Ligand binder design. Structure first.
Ligand SMILES: O=[P@]1(S)OC[C@H]2O[C@@H]3[C@H](F)[C@@H]2O[P@](=O)(S)OC[C@H]2O[C@H]([C@H](F)[C@@H]2O1)n1cnc2c(ncnc21)NC/C=C/CNc1ncnc2c1ncn23
Lengths: 176, 173
């Protein structure tokens, strides 16, 4: 199946490489006193898994209560003949009543965009593939030594009375 | 199937985004970065598709006649909540009798590493062939593919990766 392969490549080509280095990058960021005064960055990578596979490029677009703060110090690695392939991650402030409620490294699971592009014009099959992607990735990370309470999957369906920031803050507070 | 999905994601998540900007980046390198006496970097992205899915991280490992020259000027784009996701590509000199015979932007199709890490050698060879077949069909139909991308699919049996790439470079001129 398509989703089986996308989930395994998402682990093998990304999460396997960055999760071992994530604690050290977030720690490096938090150890700068002027960063920490704004607020401590949470110690997990938060991965948004919208089951409708709607992956916008900007999080501020999806919810203005998700505000871009800064980038993590980037990780580099030689891979498949590309010298210094760069792994960049973005830090976001989550607003509640116009005030910062939390700070975290937050992004969409990009492979869902492939499932969406494959079937924008089948919505039932896309929902099945999205669920399979999440289920498979959950099983990989459950068994993987790189996943050590440093990664949180946030799977959701939109009901347009929805708060993405509240969904993230729900998960963020549970980990604290 | 796995390879069908990997091929489509390789187009949608990479080739679709970088191939429209590749001519401008190679032109920028040839006009501003390339040393006065060095041969021009060729105008196409050369993608190595080893059917055994053996994808080393360094090209000098697979053949020492593939020498790293420089990196292209990097491309950035906001994507899936990551601000300024960076697309970096590496330029290689291909040596013949110790001297440069061509220069090109060269890399492996990284998704083959996923097929390798993942189902016997025979099944893996079938998935690699399906990956190549599917990617060929996508690029045949795609407006971003305008003679600016070259797929180099090969089976190793005494084999020269540099000669295989130089064969394709010479066909384009
Ligand atoms: O196994 P791979 S290396 O990655 C799978 C998956 O893992 C995830 C993401 F979700 C991926 O899917 P996608 O974005 S639709 O790309 C599908 C394939 O196209 C190919 C490459 F073959 C991809 O397959 N591809 C994509 N980007 C990219 C690239 N340089 C060269 N080839 C690239 N530079 C930009 C950023 C590179 C590092 N930074 C990353 N940041 C975030 N997520 C990341 C990164 N690298 C991986 N991933």
């Amino acid at each position: 199946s398509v989703a089986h392969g996308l989930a395994w490549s998402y682990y093998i080509g990304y999460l396997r490489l960055i999760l071992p280095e994530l604690q050290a990058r977030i720690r490096t960021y938090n150890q700068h006193y002027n960063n920490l005064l704004r607020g401590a960055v949470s110690q997990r990578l938060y991965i948004l898994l919208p089951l409708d596979c709607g992956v916008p490029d900007n999080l501020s677009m999806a919810d203005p209560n998700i505000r871009f703060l800064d980038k993590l110090p980037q990780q580099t690695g030689d891979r498949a003949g590309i010298k210094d392939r760069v792994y960049s991650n973005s830090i976001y402030e989550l607003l509640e009543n116009g005030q910062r409620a939390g700070t975290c490294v937050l992004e969409y699971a990009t492979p869902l965009q492939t499932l969406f592009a494959m079937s924008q014009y089948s919505r039932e099959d896309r929902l099945e593939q999205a669920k399979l992607f999440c289920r498979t990735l959950e099983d990989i990370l459950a068994d993987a030594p790189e996943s050590q309470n440093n990664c949180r999957l946030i799977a959701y369906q939109e009901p347009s009375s929805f708060s993405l920031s509240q969904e993230v803050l729900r998960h963020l507070r549970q980990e604290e």
